[PDB]
């Protein structure tokens, strides 16, 4: 099924302590601890880096060695276990960075997987219920359940058989030296795992194949299991969590609203564990940290998306940013354009944090705005705030080559709800906690009756725990079927971004373009351009959305045929887009439908501006000409602009006609076709002032 | 586009107050009071009825003919108030008609006389306020109902001509507003009578919302078997559902089949009953629990579960009173001792002023004559009246099922185990919690400060289940096999989308015993005497797969003769068998190994294969092999003594339908074959 370096593998038998879990470091922590405690001295660094491999009754006459004969190693080896086990149940097993996405990826490759641990059945079962990794494997094999343990090839001969596997089907992961000869000499795809210890000569020439951690055997196996498709709508998050953080630098419409979605769905196989967003909006913050999730919905399909693991963080809070700008692998900047300036300050600190701390891996940073060289905007604003900052030329310089800077394009109409409309939804849904907490108390008791399994012992402490989760649970029952509604966006799933990262070749509601520029052009032209040509219309004709508008018969069918006149240009010019046109074009015409909140102003803002040569509006017009294709509706679109102009914002008809034959003159038509297209569009302009 | 009794339909317009919910009824009262308690003479009955689906402004000038702004004000406050105790009232069906309509792609809105501040605080208190694109109120239309402006208004901002769209409505001056508008008007009697004038007028009446509901579902498109990660639905209907034992199927098969319902609603609560108090009190302090699915490391979270003692009398009332489905998960153990339950139930649901769905969950060849026999029974006993037993047994629809899907039950020492390791993490996040919303925000300081209020004690209870986001209840382990095959017969079963319907399910029964269960067990004795405790790896050794593929050919070729009609298809069934034992390793084999005499029996999946090859001269050498594993099993793992194990085999084989001459001869190579696995 799975093909790893022209071998077929059917199988994964993992080792646990040392390759799945850092327990090998924690049994080193906790070894000092427990010396500290009891002879006073503390077990040095180098002496456990030297018993590493060896026995426990080797290890104990190396201690007698150096710290005398009467040393008392088995007390200390059993304190330090009691630590371990301490430390493991309340703060959990600690994970190898990568793991989870390892076993996602062979697990979804329809692998049979199996650990092949040297603990026992009942400790080895514990662990890998509390790292929430069992689910994974089909059978466990153990030490215990062996004639002859590592180095001896038995127990992963059995693993293997257990799986109805040959050993040569399987991949097998280990990190000591025992254990490598163990799944080596049973003839399975040995790969080495550096764990503490730098593995020997003997190791590496054993080894089919070795890596420095998990995160280097992950970027291995991404060559050779799939990209994920596009996620369509309603379409689950997965459920398996990385050890990977991200950053929404605004939690605003189009932040909460569709990034999240992105953030959310990640690669397929595992999802960010926290996605850290930032406003200065308090009662947003309070309210998702109060929920500890909020909710998108698409109205079109009464749909209500739980966006989960969610840290709304205050935008002035300093602490708190950083936080983001250090921990966070991929950080969304998705602020207005009248925001940057005055933001490129704290993202010039949070960069500056990241420069200082011992952040290690290169942030991914997506520029989010509807703008045309968005991106050369924040790098102008962050390169001043760099300087300001630090005074240092050389390390300002240093901060803006070691980051991936994405431009990105973005097709999604989001809302963000009003604080009123949030205040009337957290009183009504407060309303049903205290009238789900007046009937959680009539229940009332808890009892476990003559089980005649558990002892009476165990029998008496699930009476406990079952009594403390009722307590701190059922007041949140309601979540169940509640959801903290904050957005409603529109069903648009692709975003393109600027194609370099290595953290985007997997991010499946990503697509990577080598160059934004053709997407870009796109989006003006049969997008923006469209929008602004229009709500030139539905302004004139007296309506106060664009939303409602589209009632008139007149104004919707301006809309479905400017649209197919601009993407028959654009079929011409970028048939490689071809998908993209249909796509996006029938996705503005629903978006439209019902686009009541945002207004006509902000679309149909300077108009004289929008209708030059190289523009969205006048482009298009001189691309079908050229081809010999039809643009009545986008003549009609280009004098409604002119008309918008000198009506609302009160500019002379003179100025109009003086801009206009001078972005005629530029474009590269044929003297006659230029005259020609001066003399209509006039027309047009005198027409619709009666 | 949906096409509704012939005519197209792109939109549908519904009227709030007496057609969505009851608050005709409730502002009936108020008014009566607010009358009361300020000018001292209550309103009439003839005003009121007069002022049903009229806007405020519209029943000042009515009240100001016969004889108002001081008074309604005070009837709101009185509505509202009742409204945030008791919840509103939902006329039931309504959730359920939304969702069809909303999926059929069609243009939905609201047309209510109420205020704007009034509609909206209902319609997010029901939850119904996502399924319409815009609403019209009676505050920005001028002439209000009787006058169509207000179903005009509500189909030009939908973007359609208001003959394209479907209009809801319960009063009678509404109705005509409806009807003027020029539009498929629907009436649904709430609190009057309907007139000649108005069911004239109306195109198709309806006595309550869910009549409707029937009659739209037959243009609603069924949706097919679902996939395994696919989601249930988000919207709950008002229809409870029941299952008569939380165990491997009931909890881990069921659960499922009715969290998917129909697809386009999902029941309000399921209510499983279960004599296990570590699992009742586990689910209902988690809230949900979770069927793993290990194939493919999935976990399917289950909500809206209230899990019952089976004792408890008031609770099993409770669930076969109130439940549209029931579904009986017990062992034929049980059925004679919880019949007695089925029967209080089935009699407090008659003596309750919708038929009941009863599906028999059970791996017996005639299930259903065995409950039906236990249950006539009961009732007579109780009721002591032959009259109203014979209209319950013939009332509800009581189908066979066949139930494929490999199911297992956590043991009662990892359950513990779990709730352990789950309980430490909860107790180290209560630390991790240790210890104002500033700054006008478009809000006055009043409702700032009020908003602090409520996230200030929201967060006090739901910050300590915030772990529940990662944390999932694991209870079951299961392949992934989706379809249920139910007996024809029960309307709702049609809607169903797990449920496949067949006729002939009595022939499906009896291969499924011999050819499934009847392989699954033998195995499973020759498994478990060899040391393997999963079916999974057990299917691993090559002995034990080739003496299951060994068997199925001695069972097939048996049934073959016995159903020549069915022997095209045995080939498909005996490798889908195959196909989910290979990596069944969450599957133990002393859950498969269960009652080895039970199984053992003369018309049971082990002993009935033997015959029909004996009769026919066919061979059944394998057959005999797992009869005397099945003996071995039961007086080495389960201990029941050695010459009770003889007095059984020795009284099936006199039950067996052959010759005296192949009865001595099956037990002289029987018996024989079973000192030879000891000895
Ligand atoms: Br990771
Ligand atoms: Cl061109
Ligand atoms: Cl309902
Ligand atoms: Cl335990
Ligand atoms: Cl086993
Ligand atoms: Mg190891
Ligand atoms: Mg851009
Ligand atoms: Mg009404």
């Known amino acids: 099924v799975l093909i790893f370096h022209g071998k077929p593998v059917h199988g994964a038998i993992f080792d646990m302590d040392g390759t799945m879990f850092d327990t090998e470091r924690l049994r ?112 466990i094999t153990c030490g215990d359940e062996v004639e002859q343990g590592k180095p001896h090839p038995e127990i992963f001969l059995k693993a293997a058989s257990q799986l109805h596997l040959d050993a040569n089907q399987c991949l097998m992961f280990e990190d000591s030296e025992n254990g490598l000869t163990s799944a080596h000499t049973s003839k399975g795809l040995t790969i080495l795992l550096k764990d503490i210890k730098e593995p020997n000569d003997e190791m590496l020439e054993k080894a089919h194949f070795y890596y420095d951690q998990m995160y280097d055997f992950l970027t291995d196996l991404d060559q050779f299991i799939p990209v994920m498709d596009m996620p369509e709508m309603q379409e689950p998050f997965p459920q398996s969590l990385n050890q990977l953080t991200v950053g929404i630098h605004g939690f605003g419409a189009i932040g909460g609203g569709y990034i999240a979605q992105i953030l959310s769905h990640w690669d397929g196989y595992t999802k960010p564990k926290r996605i850290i967003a930032s406003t200065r909006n308090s009662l947003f913050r309070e309210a998702v940290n109060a929920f500890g999730t909020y909710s998108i919905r698409y109205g079109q399909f009464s749909y209500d998306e739980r966006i989960e693991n969610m840290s709304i963080v205050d935008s002035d809070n300093e602490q708190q940013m950083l936080e983001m700008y250090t921990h966070s692998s991929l950080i969304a900047l998705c602020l207005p354009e009248q925001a940057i300036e005055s933001e490129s300050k704290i993202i010039a600190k949070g960069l500056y944090a990241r420069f200082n701390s011992q952040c290690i891996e290169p942030l991914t940073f997506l520029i989010i705005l509807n703008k045309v060289g968005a991106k050369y905007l924040v790098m102008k604003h962050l390169k001043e705030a ?98 903290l509604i904050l957005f409603h966006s529109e069903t648009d799933m692709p975003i393109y971004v600027e194609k370099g990262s290595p953290l985007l070749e997997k991010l499946r509601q990503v697509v990577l373009v080598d160059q934004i520029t053709d997407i870009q052009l796109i989006k003006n032209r049969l997008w923006n351009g469209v929008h602004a040509m229009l709500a030139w219309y539905a302004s004139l004709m007296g309506y106060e959305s664009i939303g409602v508008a589209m009632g008139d018969h007149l104004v919707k069918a301006f809309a479905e045929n400017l649209i197919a006149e601009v993407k028959q240009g654009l079929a011409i010019v970028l048939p490689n887009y071809a998908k993209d046109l249909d796509r996006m074009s029938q996705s503005f015409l629903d978006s439209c439908e019902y686009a009541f909140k945002d207004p006509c102003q902000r679309v149909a803002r300077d108009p004289l501006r929008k209708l030059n040569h190289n523009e969205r509006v006048m482009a298009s017009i001189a691309v079908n000409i050229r081809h010999d294709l039809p643009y009545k509706n986008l003549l009609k679109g280009a004098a409604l602009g002119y008309a918008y102009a000198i009506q609302f914002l009160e500019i002379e008809e003179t100025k109009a006609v003086e801009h206009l034959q001078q972005q005629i003159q530029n474009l590269d038509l044929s003297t006659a076709q230029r005259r020609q297209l001066e003399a209509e569009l006039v027309q047009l302009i005198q027409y619709l002032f009666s």
């Not at 989870?100 to 400790?123: C, F, N, P």
């Not at 109409?413 to 957290?426: F, G």
Request: negative net charge; aromatic residues 8%; contains cysteine.
């Open 28 to 139: 080193f922590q906790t070894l000092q601890q427990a010396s500290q405690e009891l002879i006073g001295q503390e077990f040095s660094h180098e002496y456990l880096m030297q018993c590493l491999g060896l026995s426990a009754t080797t290890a104990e006459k190396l201690a007698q060695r150096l710290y005398g004969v009467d040393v008392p190693y088995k007390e200390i080896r059993k304190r330090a276990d009691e630590m371990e086990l301490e430390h493991i149940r309340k703060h959990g097993v600690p994970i190898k960075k990568g793991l989870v996405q390892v076993l996602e990826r062979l697990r979804k490759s329809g692998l049979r997987m199996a650990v092949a641990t040297s603990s026992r059945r009942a400790i080895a079962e514990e662990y890998l219920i509390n790292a929430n990794v069992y689910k994974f494997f089909d059978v």
């Open 386 to 483: 760099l300087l300001e900052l630090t005074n240092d030329e050389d390390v300002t310089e240093h901060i803006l080559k070691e980051h991936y800077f994405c431009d990105t394009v973005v097709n999604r109409m989001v809302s963000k709800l009003s604080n009123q409309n949030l205040y009337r939804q957290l009183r009504i849904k407060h309303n049903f906690l205290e009238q789900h907490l007046e009937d959680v108390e009539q229940e009332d008791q808890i009892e476990i009756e003559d089980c005649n399994k558990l002892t009476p012992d165990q029998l008496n402490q699930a009476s406990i725990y079952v009594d403390n989760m009722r307590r701190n649970f059922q007041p949140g029952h309601i979540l169940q079927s509640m959801d």
